């Protein structure tokens, strides 16, 4: 906590709250001016001014894949005590710290950071860092099973049901039977205090009948497609648009709804946009929302805001929620959406 930053804390708080970018750049400003490291310092301000800062934005800054952001987090998470803490408790504390982003990849980056720190501070508890990430994802999946009011008590995961999934999890080995009993019981008696973001950044398409939507229907078929063009899904975007697809991990669409992320990139303009699909399932419905969601987000580059607007305008269903991105204000996204929704609303 450096004194030049501490002095104008209120100013940095006012800037960050208004627009995170402004505030971050105002932290960097003082850091440059006083020949000091921003990553280690952003992390500190975020910690210190927790009761003051926009926790939605903070969580959103820390969960972003950008190099600077990724470093800030390594520093944020390192500044946490996990020494002495139980795996269940250390994690119980970690998650409690954030206004949890409402998107799988963002959550993953977070869980991945805890894993690396819990293992650093407790090298004896888990065999390696990969083993901590496994245990955490099993713990988070366990948290759903043990507290789902729909699932009958007879179908809710057992203690030995845990030990089974974790045979070969401790760096190609088993974890201590008494530690998993202490894990399972700790999380049986108390569920994780998980506060999520209200509305996630960019365009969010969500309805109880979005599953019925032709564009949504098409986009889903696309996720299990080989060599297909995206203009078949979105004819409002250019012909010249390349796509990459990241399919969901070990924890399937059944335990999140998360059906994956499509990344669209204009091969002439370098405008980028990402589509995220979430379809409610028996396990997910209770924790992650009962209605399908489509989150469209523009890249940092020029015209990315149009690509995103073009994809969202092609949808029949309306965009239920608009939210400012780190580089784009709510209004500009509305401007481009209504514009393409007036443009595409022609033969």
Numbering used by the authors: 1 to 347
Report text from the authors:
The intracellular pathogens Legionella pneumophila (Lp) and Rickettsia prowazekii (Rp) inject an effector (RalF) that diverts the host trafficking small GTPase Arf1. RalF proteins are related to eukaryotic ArfGEFs, from which they depart by a unique auto-inhibitory capping domain that contains localization and functional determinants. One of these effector proteins, RalF, contains a Sec7 homology region, which is the catalytic domain in eukaryotic guanine nucleotide exchange factors (GEFs) that is sufficient to activate Arf by stimulating GDP/GTP exchange. In the case of Lp, LpRalF recruits Arf1 to the Legionella-containing vacuole (LCV), where the pathogen replicates.
Structural studies showed that the C-terminal domain of LpRalF intimately associates with the Sec7 domain to block access to the Arf-binding site. In this work, we demonstrate that interactions between an aromatic cluster of amino acids in the LpRalF C-terminal capping domain and lipid membranes provides a signal that relieves autoinhibition and converts LpRalF to a highly potent ArfGEF. Auto-inhibition and membrane recruitment are mediated by the same region of the capping domain, thus making both states mutually exclusive and establishing a membrane-driven binary switch. Our data show that the membrane sensor of the capping domain of LpRalF contains protruding α-helices that expose aromatic and lysine residues. This atypical composition and structure endows it with a dual sensitivity to packing and electrostatic properties of lipid membranes, but not to curvature. We propose that the aromatic residues encode the sensitivity of LpRalF to packing defects by peripheral insertion into the lipid bilayer, and the lysines recognize negatively charged membrane surfaces by electrostatic interactions. Our in vitro analysis predicts that LpRalF uses the membrane sensor encoded in the aromatic cluster to spatially and temporally regulate Arf activation during the course of LCV maturation. Consistently, despite its high exchange activity on negatively charged liposomes in vitro, M45-flagged LpRalFF255K failed to recruit Arf1 at the LCV in infected cells, likely due to mislocalization.
